[model samples]
Target: KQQNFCVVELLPSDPEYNTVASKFNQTCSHFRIEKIERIQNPDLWNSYQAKKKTMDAKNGQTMNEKQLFHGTDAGSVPHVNRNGFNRSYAGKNAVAYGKGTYFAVNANYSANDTYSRPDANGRKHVYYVRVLTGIYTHGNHSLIVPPSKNPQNPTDLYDTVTDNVHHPSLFVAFYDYQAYPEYLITFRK
Candidate 1:
């Protein structure tokens, strides 16, 4: 069984940190920071791995069932509405797909005296990212694929080329303040 996956990269803060923060704010809806301790117990590890395997198998199949891409001159890419909007395109290089299915890696954040929010009181700030996806009717965007005549070529579905270019949006992740620049906590449906 294959599991759905994504990767997020976290970098240290410095003079250049504002640039990254601006970009993240522009792309994502919100972020949160929390406190948690590391888990190193063998019994916990075994139980986690077993449950993860079962989840992976279930997620892989569910992801395949949602049509989520678009074919274009630029090559097959994740479909974005005319507003250049899609829950998946929120952050630079961060991919989003079906509303509850894939995993993200490397997505975390940090805080120091120079980077800490005024209210944070010197603790690191680990960023949390949630990619929310759903169908909306407010836009004037065209469909990724036009209607097709062949019964096999469903007009209501996104083209196969597009579907192959992006991952589903079901997966979400949380990061703890202490692991700022290195770890991530992810959740999947």
Candidate 2:
């Protein structure tokens, strides 16, 4: 079928991994949740991927989103991690994240990006990673794209990146802002 976003999954160790926890785990398949897990919000995933793909496809873009971040880079937020890894920074910016893994992020990067600095000299590839969210839904554990929030209570509307307090084993986000301007993803097992 050659579905999109599948090529990246070939590595077996890149986007999906065993070294870390993911929302993709089968145990997470339920209308309810425990501490944390992957996710299943087609709306959230579809929207997030759509926006990212659009911005990424814009080969002629050449401007910043002017997105504003208010706190430490979400990727390496202090005490945000419980795994050995913690939030460090390059030039006091994004450094490490879940399980204590260092990450890549430009300083001044934050969520709620109204506009982001274009890639190289283009318009797309900005830092504004938009996403979609919804209440809990139960069914076949999805992979392609899941909602920002899966099964649970109101917090069900808060998964990896949405609810900072209840981040899964591998919740990832950008700087910081409304809609998060970035994604807060989970993992699978």
Candidate 3:
């Protein structure tokens, strides 16, 4: 039903999966922890590979020198990302909270979007999540307060302004009663 926003918000171990109705839900929470995932970010990996090809072609570069250049520290290297587990999302270390968890996917993206992030095979990928769990905390949002003047320096006056453009923001709720134009909305109880 509409009450279940995303697969009823069930964890993988939840008994709801055995039920037939749950199968109809797209964003089912049938996920697990401790699994490794690679984002098929083609643009990023292609850039990496293109750079790797040039790096692999250079002088005095011997052996699987691509591996050599990337895998181990030899020449002024911060070569940790080479041996893998360097994606920062990779759970190589367990000390950090996000370090050891996994993201079992609900669905893989298809290259239906060129503007959105590309999958490794260069497909449009709009992402979604039922949230077994995830977080991408960015800096907080604030307002365009009028520029304030220091009494000592009248020239240092401040003015507040708001932009007319709008897009989805991660955190629309913050600081005071301040708001955007479309933020002028609510669901009536």
Candidate 4:
């Protein structure tokens, strides 16, 4: 079933808002949250789930999904809100990790101006995105996509790529449907 793009404003006192707020506050202590909006797009969600199910079955149900953050400019906010994340806009930031859309584990990392550029009103925005990281490997700036697991099997590639293998602070997604922007957080430093 298809549905129109929709968003609902979340009250600060609500549990959902507090969940995001607490996470954001703990990492980005200096920023003050102005609002939080939940993105409710059934079509976008279904596509994400479909890919997730395929990946899950392929890797014995280890989709490795995580609630991550994505920082972006104001212009992309409306576009992302309407159509999920666009992989074409990958290199807006440094492409050290395969020139894919980057998701941050720490709110503070995404709160940086380099990723989360403020709007004309001087307010910044970041997305609480649900990402399927799966089995990942370290990547380089030269890589366009994740490397194959075996040299002979080009079709069998790693699910994602990261800057660090031991403890990854950032995740890179070359596929456009690999992430679902669940919430939009409006704030300022």
TM-score of each: 0.22, 0.21, 0.19, 0.94
lDDT tens per residue, model 3, 1-189: 111111123334556423312321243233222111122323334444453354345322332111100011112111211211223422222222222212212222111121123334432222221111111222212322222235676553221111211321121111111111100000000
The local distance difference test score of each candidate is 0.26, 0.26, 0.22, 0.85
Tell me the TM-score of model 3: 0.19
Task: Please give, for residues 1-189, the per-residue lDDT of candidate 4 as tens digits.
Answer: 333678899987899988988888878878888899999888889988998888888777564798999999889976787667666677565777777888889999999988899988999999999999998999888877789978997899888888798998998888877899999999987
Query: Candidates ranked by TM-score, best first?
Result: 4, 1, 2, 3
**CA error at residue 127 for candidate 2, angstroms:** 17
Give the Å shift of residue 147 in candidate 4. Answer: 0.7
Which runs in model 4 stand beyond 4 Å of their true positions? Answer: 1-3, 61-63
Error of 2 at 136 (Å): 33
- Residue 172 of model 3, lDDT score: 14
* Residue ranges of candidate 3 with Cα displaced over 4 Å: 1-33, 60-189
Global Cα lDDT for candidate 3: 0.22
Candidate 4 local distance difference test against the native? 0.85
| The best candidate in terms of TM-score | 4
Residue 43 CA error for candidate 3 (Å)? 0.4
Kindly report which residue pairs in candidate 4 clash with one another: none
Model 3 lDDT at residue 110: 14
